Design a protein around this nucleic acid. Structure first.
Lengths: 91, 79, 91, 103, 95, 78, 101, 94
DNA sequence: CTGGAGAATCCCGGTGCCGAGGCCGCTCAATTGGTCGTAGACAGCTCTAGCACCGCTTAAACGCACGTACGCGCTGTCCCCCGCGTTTTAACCGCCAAGGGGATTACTCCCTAGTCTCCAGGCACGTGTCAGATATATACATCCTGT
DNA sequence: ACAGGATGTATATATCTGACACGTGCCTGGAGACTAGGGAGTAATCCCCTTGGCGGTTAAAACGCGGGGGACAGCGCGTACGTGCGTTTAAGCGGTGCTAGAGCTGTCTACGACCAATTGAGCGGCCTCGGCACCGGGATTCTCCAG
C-alpha cells in the first residue's frame, strides 16, 4: 500500500485536470442533448464544466474519506458516499 | 449511455487526489451516478440561460453563472 | 403595512371552502409569498442585467421560474403563467 | 372599470405586483406582461401549498390550518421540500423519523 | 424498577417528535442571548419577538445537528452519539 | 458564564426530538459550544443590522434578516 | 481625478459608474465609490501579497493559480470568505490523514 | 476593431507592483484576481442595496458600504477594510 | 532489528519556446462648471413597550442508587483490492475544410414611462361568537416478568 | 411463545374561552385616457469559430495473476448511562412602576441628478526576449527483505 501514498502525494502536488477530455465532452453533449437538441458548446464552456466536475468530485471524495476513517476503516464504500451526500444536504 | 466512458483509473486518480488509500470495487458506479446528477443540474441551468438569450451556443459565461447559482462559484473563466 | 392576507384567504376559500386558516399560518403564507416573489424578481433582474436589456417581460419571468422552481413545479407554473398572460392579452 | 386581476382571471393583486416591481428597481422598465405572469405564478404556488396543508388538516380531523399542517405539507411533498430545504417554519415541529436500528 | 432497558427513550422520541412547543427554558436563553450581545454593542434592548425568533432558530439548528449526528453515529455501528460524531457532522457540513 | 444555564435535560429533550436514542456524557459541553457559536454569529449580524439603522432596540425583523443572511430563513415573524 | 485625491490605485470613477448602471439604488452618495474602491484595493493587496509570499517560497517570480490557491487556503479568514469558491487549475491542499500513514 | 470588455487588470497589476516590487503575474492568475474582485464588488453592492431597501432610504452612502463590509467580510478583514475605507473617505473629503 | 540494494527522489545545468511586459493610435468615458429639485440632517413631540422588582406556586432541575446494555479491545478468517506485466484500444496531436451562427448595422414602430382625474378596493378598527382547549369518566392497546 | 397485570394512550362528555370571521368607516394607489420617445423586432451582411473528418502514433486503459492485509463477525469484560426517586430551586405567573427610545412630524439646507464641453486613461494590436517547461545526468533518500 505504498504506491497509494506515492500517488496521493503526486496528484495533490499537481494542478492539471485528470478527467479524459474527449469522453467527458461526449458525456456533456449527451446530457445536454435531452434539454435542448442541436446544441454547440464552446471549448471554454466544456473546460469550465470539467473543472467544476473535478472540484466537486474531489470534495465529495474528501468527505467520503473522512466518513470512512470515522468508522475505523480505510476502504471507502458506497455507504460512505451516500452518507456524505445525505449530510451535505445535496440529497 | 456515455457516462460509462469515464474510465475506472480516472476515478482512482480523482480519489487519490482527495486523499484516499483504498477504494471498494462498488465505488466506481456510485461516483458515476453522482457525477451525472451534478452535470445534469449544471447543464440544465446553463441550457436555460442560453435559451433565454436565444443563442444556440453555450458560452463559458452561461456555465459560470449556472455554477454560481448552485453555490459553487468558479473563478478564472470570466465573470 | 401591506400584506397578501386577503388574497391568500380568497385562494384558500377557492380550494378548500370549509377550512379556515389561523393567524400564524397566514403570516407564514405571507412570508412565503414575499420570499418567492423576491427570488423571482431578483432572478429576473439578474437575467435582464446579463443580457443588458433594461426591460422585464414575460419571457424573463418565465426563464426565472424555470431556473428557480424545480421540476414539475416549474412546468406547472410556466403553464399557468402562459395561460394567464394569453387570457389577459385577448381581454 | 375592471381591475387587471379580473381581466387575467386570477385572484392576486396584479397591480400591486407591478408597483412592487417598479418600486424595487429590479429593472429600468417593466413590461405589461410581467405582473400578470408573476401574479399567476404566485397564486399557483399559494394554491398548491394551501391545498396540501388543507389535506393534512383533514387527515388530522382539524378544520383550521395551523403551522404544523403547513410544515407537514412542505416536508411531505418532494418538490416543495426541495424548494424549501433550508427554510425553518416557526412552531411547526419536525417530521416523525425514528431510525430502524434504534427500535 | 419497572421497564428500564431504554423504552422510555423511544417513548420520549415519539412524544417530542409529535410536540411543537419550545423546549429551551425561556429565561436562561434570554440571559444567554443578552450576554452574547453584550460584547458587540453595550446596553442593547431586545424585543420579545426577537428573542422568540432567536430561540426558534436555535432549536431548529440544534435539531438538525442532532439528526445529522445520529446518522453519523449509526453509520459507525454505534447507538450512543459521541463528541467526535458532532465534530464530523459539523466538518462535513462546511459551516 | 451564562451558557451553563442550559441544563442537561433540555439538551436531552432536544436530542430526543432529533431521533437520538442514547447520549454520551461528553456531548453536553459540545452542544453548548456549538449553540454559543451559532448564537454569536446570528446576534453579531443582527447587531450590525441594528447599528446601521441608528437604533438601540434589536427587533424581530433584524434577527430574521440576520438568519436569512446565513441561508436559514425563518417564516412566521414578518 | 478622484483616485488621485483619495490616494487609491483603483478606478473610483469606474466603480461609481458600475454602481449607477447596476441599478443597485436610485441614488449614489459621493463618498460611497471611494469607500468601495478602498475596500477592493485592500482585499486585492492582501490576496496578492499572500500569493507573492507563496511564490517566493516556491522559488518563482510569476504568480500562478496554484500560488493563489495556496495563499487563499492557508490564510484563515480568506478561506472562510472563499469557502465555496472553486479556483480553476488551482489544485488541492496537500493533506494526508494521520491514520492513512 | 472589436468591442472591449472593461476589467481591473491594470489596477491589479499596479497593486501587485506596489506590494511586491519584482513579482509578475500570469494571465490565468490575473483572470482569477479579476473575477475575485468582481465577485467581491457584486457582493458588497448587493448587500448595500438590500440594506438601503430595508430602511427605505434610496441612497447608498459610505455608511451603507461600511455596514455591508462589516456584514460580508469576517473579523480582522472587516476591521482592516473599515479602517482603510474611513481613511480614504477622510483624505478624499479634504 | 540491521545492513545491502534498488527505485524513486531532487539538484544542476543546457535548450528552446511563447506568453508576459512595454509602446503606439485613439476613442469614449471621467471630470469640471453650473443649475435645480428634494431627500436627509436636525429639532421636537407623543406614548408604546421594554426593563426592573416583588411575592407566590410548583414544575422541573439536581443529587444519588443501581444494574443492565452497549462500547471497546482482542482473535480468527477469508476475500478483495493493490502491484505489476502484458495486450489491446482509442485519445490525441496535426492539418483541412465547411458553414452555421454570433456580432454588428439600419429602419421602423409599438409599447411603456410620465401625468391628470376619479374613486373603489384595501386597511384599521369595533363586534359576536363558534371552533379551539381542558379536566373528569371509562375503554383499549402495549411492555414486563413469569410461566 | 402465552398470559395476567400495570401503564400509557384514546374516546366522550360538559365547561369555558378568546381568535377569527364579520361588519363599519376612511383613504391612496389602481384604472383609464392622453402624450411622446426609444428599446424591440426584423432583415442583412460578414467572417470566426465549432463540428466533422482523416491518419498516424503511442499514452494508457483492460485484463489477469499473486497474496497480504483488513473487513467483518464473534467473543468477552468493563463501566457508564438510562431509569426511577427523594430533595431542592429557581422558572413562570401575575401585578406594579418607571421611562428609553420607537415612531412620527415639521423645517430648511446641503447634496446628488443632470446638461454640455473637454481631453486623456485605458484598451487593442503589434511587437520583443527572458522566465520557465523540459530533458538528461548525476547525487541523495526511501522501502524492502535476507540475515
Amino acid at each position: 500500500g505504498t504506491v497509494a501514498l506515492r500517488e496521493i502525494r503526486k496528484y495533490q502536488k499537481s494542478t492539471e485536470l485528470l478527467i479524459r477530455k474527449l469522453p467527458f465532452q461526449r458525456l456533456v453533449r449527451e446530457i445536454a442533448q435531452d434539454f435542448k437538441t442541436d446544441l454547440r458548446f464552446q471549448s471554454s464552456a466544456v473546460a469550465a464544466l470539467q473543472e467544476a466536475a473535478e472540484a466537486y468530485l474531489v470534495g465529495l471524495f474528501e468527505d467520503t474519506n473522512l466518513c470512512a476513517i470515522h468508522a475505523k476503516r480505510v476502504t471507502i464504500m458506497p455507504k460512505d458516499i451516500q452518507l456524505a451526500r445525505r449530510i451535505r444536504g445535496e440529497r | 449511455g456515455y457516462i460509462q466512458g469515464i474510465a475506472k483509473p480516472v476515478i482512482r486518480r480523482l480519489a487519490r487526489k482527495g486523499g484516499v488509500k483504498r477504494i471498494s470495487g462498488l465505488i466506481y458506479k456510485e461516483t458515476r451516478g453522482v457525477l451525472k446528477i451534478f452535470l445534469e443540474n449544471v447543464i440544465r441551468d446553463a441550457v436555460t440561460y442560453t435559451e433565454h438569450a436565444r443563442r444556440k451556443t453555450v458560452t463559458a459565461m452561461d456555465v459560470v453563472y449556472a455554477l454560481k447559482r448552485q453555490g459553487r462559484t468558479l473563478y478564472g473563466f470570466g465573470g | 403595512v401591506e400584506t397578501y392576507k386577503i388574497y391568500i384567504f380568497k385562494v384558500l376559500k377557492q380550494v378548500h371552502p370549509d377550512i379556515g386558516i389561523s393567524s400564524k399560518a397566514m403570516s407564514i403564507m405571507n412570508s412565503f409569498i414575499n420570499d418567492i416573489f423576491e427570488k423571482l424578481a431578483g432572478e429576473s433582474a439578474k437575467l435582464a442585467r446579463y443580457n443588458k436589456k433594461p426591460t422585464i417581460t414575460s419571457r424573463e419571468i418565465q426563464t426565472s421560474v424555470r431556473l428557480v422552481l424545480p421540476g414539475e413545479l416549474a412546468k406547472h407554473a410556466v403553464s399557468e403563467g402562459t395561460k394567464a398572460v394569453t387570457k389577459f392579452t385577448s381581454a | 372599470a375592471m381591475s387587471r386581476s379580473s381581466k387575467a382571471g386570477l385572484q392576486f393583486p396584479v397591480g400591486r405586483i407591478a408597483r412592487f416591481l417598479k418600486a424595487g428597481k429590479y429593472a429600468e422598465r417593466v413590461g405589461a406582461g410581467a405582473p400578470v405572469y408573476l401574479a399567476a405564478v404566485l397564486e399557483y404556488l399559494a394554491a398548491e401549498v394551501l391545498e396540501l396543508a388543507g389535506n393534512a388538516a383533514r387527515d388530522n380531523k382539524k378544520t383550521r390550518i395551523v403551522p404544523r399542517h403547513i410544515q407537514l405539507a412542505v416536508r411531505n411533498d418532494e418538490e416543495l421540500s426541495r424548494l424549501l430545504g433550508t427554510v425553518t417554519i416557526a412552531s411547526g415541529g419536525v417530521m416523525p423519523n425514528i431510525h430502524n436500528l434504534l427500535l
